[PDB]
Amino acid sequence: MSELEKAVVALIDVFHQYSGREGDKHKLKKSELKELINNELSHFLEEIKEQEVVDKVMETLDSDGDGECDFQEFMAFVAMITTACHEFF
Amino acid sequence: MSELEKAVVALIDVFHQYSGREGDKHKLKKSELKELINNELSHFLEEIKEQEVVDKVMETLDSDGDGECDFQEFMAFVAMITTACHEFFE
Numbered sequence: 212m213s214e215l216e217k218a219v220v221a222l223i224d225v226f227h228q229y230s231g232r233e234g235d236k237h238k239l240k241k242s243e244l245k246e247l248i249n250n251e252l253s254h255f256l257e258e259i260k261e262q263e264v265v266d267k268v269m270e271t272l273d274s275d276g277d278g279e280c281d282f283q284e285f286m287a288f289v290a291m292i293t294t295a296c297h298e299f300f
Numbered sequence: 301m302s303e304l305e306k307a308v309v310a311l312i313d314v315f316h317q318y319s320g321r322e323g324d325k326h327k328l329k330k331s332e333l334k335e336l337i338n339n340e341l342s343h344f345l346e347e348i349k350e351q352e353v354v355d356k357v358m359e360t361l362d363s364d365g366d367g368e369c370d371f372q373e374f375m376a377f378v379a380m381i382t383t384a385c386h387e388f389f390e
């Protein structure tokens with residue numbers, strides 16, 4: 212597989228791992244989203260150390276009101292990050 | 301890098317690999333898009349060999365109408381591909 216294909220796989224893999232920890236196995240609850248950001252985006256985003264930060268991040272990502280981040284919403288988050296990086300440079 | 305950070309960097313790098321080839325170096329024109337797909341998505345998508353298909357794929361991705369695929373449009377393309385992959389293993 213190409214680097215682009217490996218990237219696509221990485222995206223579905225990391226989501227599956229974190230979303231599958233608790234509750235709805237196809238969505239990220241707050242604790243799951245928090246750990247994904249802290250463990251997997253530590254070089255891009257400041258570490259989350261306040262519950263009010265996780266609350267605000269979920270509020271931003273959650274567009275259908277289940278209080279969770281589904282795959283579509285996670286993809287929007289990834290696009291936000293990749294764009295912010297494409298713009299940082 | 302974490303696998304996710306690697307993925308983010310790869311997306312940026314592959315886009316610039318191809319977008320820089322010709323023309324504007326910040327958008328994918330049809331020929332740039334065609335070979336990104338044929339070379340870098342050869343395991344996920346059928347190889348493009350017609351003009352009609354190059355045309356239709358660009359028509360689909362070109363949300364702002366300028367005839368090229370910019371980074372935001374490319375990210376939407378990637379979102380399409382990844383979502384299809386996710387719906388599959390699920």
Ligand SMILES: CCN(CC)C(=S)S
Nearest residue numbers: 254255295296297299
């Ligand atoms: C400067 C950090 N940036 C995100 C704001 C990335 S490393 S792409």
Ligand SMILES: CCN(CC)C(=S)S
Nearest residue numbers: 219220343344384385
């Ligand atoms: C072709 C299936 N592939 C699995 C590696 C994805 S769509 S990620």
Ligand SMILES: [Ca+2]
Nearest residue numbers: 230233235238
């Ligand atoms: Ca979950």
Ligand SMILES: [Ca+2]
Nearest residue numbers: 273274275279
């Ligand atoms: Ca949601």
Ligand SMILES: [Ca+2]
Nearest residue numbers: 319324325327
């Ligand atoms: Ca270009």
Ligand SMILES: [Ca+2]
Nearest residue numbers: 362364366368
């Ligand atoms: Ca366009």
